[PDB]
Design a binder for these strands. Structure first.
Ligand code: MG
Ligand code: MG
Ligand code: MG
Ligand code: MG
Ligand code: MG
Ligand code: MG
Ligand code: MG
Ligand code: MG
Ligand code: MG
Ligand code: MG
Ligand code: MG
Ligand code: MG
Ligand code: MG
Ligand code: MG
Ligand code: MG
Ligand code: MG
Ligand code: MG
Ligand code: MG
Ligand code: MG
Ligand code: MG
Ligand code: MG
Ligand code: MG
Ligand code: MG
Ligand code: MG
Ligand code: MG
Ligand code: MG
Ligand code: MG
Ligand code: MG
Ligand code: MG
Ligand code: MG
Ligand code: MG
Ligand code: MG
Ligand code: MG
Ligand code: MG
Ligand code: MG
Ligand code: MG
Ligand code: MG
Ligand code: MG
Lengths: 103, 67, 89, 51
RNA sequence: GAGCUGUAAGUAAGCUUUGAUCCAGAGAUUUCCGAAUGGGGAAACCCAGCAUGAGUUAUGUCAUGUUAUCGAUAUGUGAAUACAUAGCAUAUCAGAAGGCACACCCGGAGAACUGAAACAUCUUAGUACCCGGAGGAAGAGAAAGAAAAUUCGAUUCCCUUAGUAGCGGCGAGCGAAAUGGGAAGAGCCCAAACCAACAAGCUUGCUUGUUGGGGUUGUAGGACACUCUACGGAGUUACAAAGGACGACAUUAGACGAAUCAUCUGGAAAGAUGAAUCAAAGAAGGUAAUAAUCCUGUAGUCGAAAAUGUUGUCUCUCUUGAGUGGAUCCUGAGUACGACGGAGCACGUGAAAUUCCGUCGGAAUCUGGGAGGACCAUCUCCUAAGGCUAAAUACUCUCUAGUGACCGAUAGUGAACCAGUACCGUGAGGGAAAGGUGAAAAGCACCCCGGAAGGGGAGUGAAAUAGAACCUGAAACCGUGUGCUUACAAGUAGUCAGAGCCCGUUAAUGGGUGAUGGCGUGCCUUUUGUAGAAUGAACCGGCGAGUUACGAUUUGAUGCAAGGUU
């Protein structure tokens, strides 16, 4: 269960083994978007505040299950557990200790 | 907003209602006469009248229950 | 009351030509009479009203998205204030 | 022979293995298995009730 | 716990770690119509009255209450009539109405087609449909029983008994019960004798009355008359009833939760290959293809502010139990029974007992009364004419959790799709058809033709004959090309025999075409007999008909056998 600022690794796709930071997450259809990965090519006609433009190479969404968090000790991809520390709920790395990502 | 609407008097609640109902009328009136462009003020003033009428109903509930 | 029973102004090219005279057109609530439209417009705008004219319009059939239905019924008042004016932009 | 609650849980998840009481033997899990593994207390128990 | 402003895209305005959106618990608001209830009315609208309140110089207007009907309780008043009642008068109460899955249940009423190869008795069938009732179940339920043993001991339901007994134009067909085996499994209260007051007639005593006590049963009980005994018990489900306390779990939101990598092919791997790992999790669903170890989960474990839900223990509330004598008294009257006419009992009025209804008749009091399939007699059993009662049983509009040798879009609900909806009918009523881009919208920027539609490029994508009518796209049908044929010929359109001209196969004594010759009157259904001018089919595609349960009988098979079987 990856959050909005996390450094992740992709398992499946065109790009696999690739790093990148998630920038939006789309929860109710669980498709995150990772920078550099799934670069689409739109065909936009000219808009009210835009030029015509050819292809618009922006990032598409990746499924959440294709994306995995890394270990802050090993830099292996890892699953995520949960610990109760002073009432809050933090994210265990399941191979090592704490992963720290406010932003 | 239900923490300072409780702090009002039940005689300032009935004035803050008709203050907000004049406000809700003005930016519903200049929504038709089309110079508004900030239309989220309409919903937040409709809910404020609903906060102001929920606490000014449960005053009268408590005022009738302990009586 | 008294601002629940005026909903909107009516700004058309039939209505702006009546504002060349002292006549102002309002889309009032459907449950009201023209006496309390008069007693409401001189409470909001502080004018003095000579006459007022009501008419009901029926629901107008519209099809948006190729599914059929109706518009709301609406009640239109035309107030005819003696002196003063209603400031509009 | 009787219901061992820890054998019936330690074999519950392996595909192919089935735990059965000696009272609960039927023809369709005997003939489904390639091999029985009975105990001492169950071999004497199925011997008494089947003959 | 990080996004959010329904489906629903969008933009534009915004809102959120000070915790939004969402999820539960509780609460507030809750227009109008509708039993609709101030009056009316073509439901979702008119018109009020009254009392307050705002406003206005005053009206006009507006706000808030309150006003249907019978019903209950009150006091007013009291007609024809003198008292009295009728009736009117206010003032309280909100009791009734209406609705349903009303499926199941109990009552009131109650067909017909059909079967009997007609048909009337009979059957269909107390069925359907109407009504009225209700409840989570109802109904039934504590022997005037079943029986005939050394009998049992409320009711209901299940298995048998048994298609037996029996009924029946003894036709069609109906069709039990007891015993035995099981589920479930408790009994109570009242009237009456009598006693106590109380109250009135009345004459002081009796009667009547209320209330309280008393006591409810066949082994004859109880009043009574005796003797000997008390707060231990009992409990809101009957047995009389309210409401505490403190727990217990139970739902109504949730929270953790094991373990994989690499290479190959691919657009993408979960596949293949190689090496691991977890398992109280190898249920399942997702993820770009087929995943125990990617995700959601699962096994397991944990959790509740607040709401109810049951359920304990205290609290609380009620409450003496026996015995003997039975002299006397009491033990349910227009009842039981009888007659006549019906209905119900499996039983068609009969050898009809037993149970009800109408109409008239009309009893007995423990030495009583009822029943034991007519009737007597004798035995045996029971104690009618008062009432209440859980459970085992029925049903599913639903809710929660699941399941399927159940359906896959002409199926499966009519309805997988903004369905009882387009639509049809004056109305009740009838009622459709219509799922599939891709993994991801990346949904074709630009260029060209064109008024636009459309196209041709380019571009995206693994694929664009995946382009939004969008997965595959079969036939009928419509075309455009062709190789071989055809303008002297009579044709169920083929079939054998065959020259010529083309072609080269799942390579085998091949494929296409057919100058010409021989033979040859479609297919079903119906018939003695059909080319039939007898029926049916325009064609193509889908759909579209001996099934299931129960019983019976036969074989076949397999047990074991004078036994076999539940
Ligand atoms: Mg909160
Ligand atoms: Mg009315
Ligand atoms: Mg009323
Ligand atoms: Mg009124
Ligand atoms: Mg009713
Ligand atoms: Mg008949
Ligand atoms: Mg017949
Ligand atoms: Mg019958
Ligand atoms: Mg009847
Ligand atoms: Mg109920
Ligand atoms: Mg009952
Ligand atoms: Mg009863
Ligand atoms: Mg006896
Ligand atoms: Mg792999
Ligand atoms: Mg493998
Ligand atoms: Mg595929
Ligand atoms: Mg669990
Ligand atoms: Mg009696
Ligand atoms: Mg009799
Ligand atoms: Mg008897
Ligand atoms: Mg199909
Ligand atoms: Mg269908
Ligand atoms: Mg075009
Ligand atoms: Mg194709
Ligand atoms: Mg597909
Ligand atoms: Mg297609
Ligand atoms: Mg010729
Ligand atoms: Mg035919
Ligand atoms: Mg003939
Ligand atoms: Mg024949
Ligand atoms: Mg023919
Ligand atoms: Mg003919
Ligand atoms: Mg024909
Ligand atoms: Mg056909
Ligand atoms: Mg047959
Ligand atoms: Mg047989
Ligand atoms: Mg046989
Ligand atoms: Mg045999």
């Amino acid at each position: 269960h990856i959050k909005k600022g996390d450094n992740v690794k992709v398992i499946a796709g065109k790009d696999k083994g690739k790093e990148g930071k998630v920038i939006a997450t789309l929860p109710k259809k669980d498709r995150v978007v990772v920078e550099g990965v799934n670069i689409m090519k739109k065909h936009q006609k000219p808009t009210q505040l835009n030029p015509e433009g050819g292809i618009l190479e922006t990032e598409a969404a990746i499924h959440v299950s294709n994306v995995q968090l890394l270990d802050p000790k090993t830099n292996e991809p890892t699953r995520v557990g949960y610990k109760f520390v002073d009432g809050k709920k933090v994210r265990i790395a399941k191979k090592s200790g704490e992963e720290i990502k406010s932003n | 907003k239900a923490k300072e609407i409780r702090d009002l008097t039940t005689s300032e609640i009935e004035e803050q209602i008709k203050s907000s109902k004049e406000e809700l009328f003005n930016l519903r009136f200049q929504l038709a006469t089309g110079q508004l462009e900030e239309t989220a003020r309409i919903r937040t003033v409709r809910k404020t009248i609903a906060r102001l009428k929920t606490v000014a109903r449960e005053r009268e509930i408590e005022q009738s229950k302990a009586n | 009351e008294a601002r629940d029973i005026l909903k909107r102004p009516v700004i058309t090219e039939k209505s702006s030509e009546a504002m060349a005279e002292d006549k102002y057109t309002f889309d009032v609530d459907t449950r009201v009479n023209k006496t309390q439209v008069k007693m409401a417009v001189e409470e909001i705008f502080n004018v003095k009203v000579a006459s007022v004219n009501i008419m009901n319009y029926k629901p107008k059939k519209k099809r948006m998205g190729r599914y059929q239905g109706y518009t709301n019924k609406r009640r239109k008042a035309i107030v005819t204030l003696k002196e003063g004016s209603i400031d509009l932009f | 022979e009787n219901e061992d609650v820890n054998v019936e849980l330690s074999a519950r998840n392996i595909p192919g293995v089935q735990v059965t009481t000696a009272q609960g033997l039927n023809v369709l899990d005997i003939t489904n298995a390639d091999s029985l593994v009975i105990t001492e207390a169950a071999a004497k128990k199925v011997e008494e009730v089947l003959g």
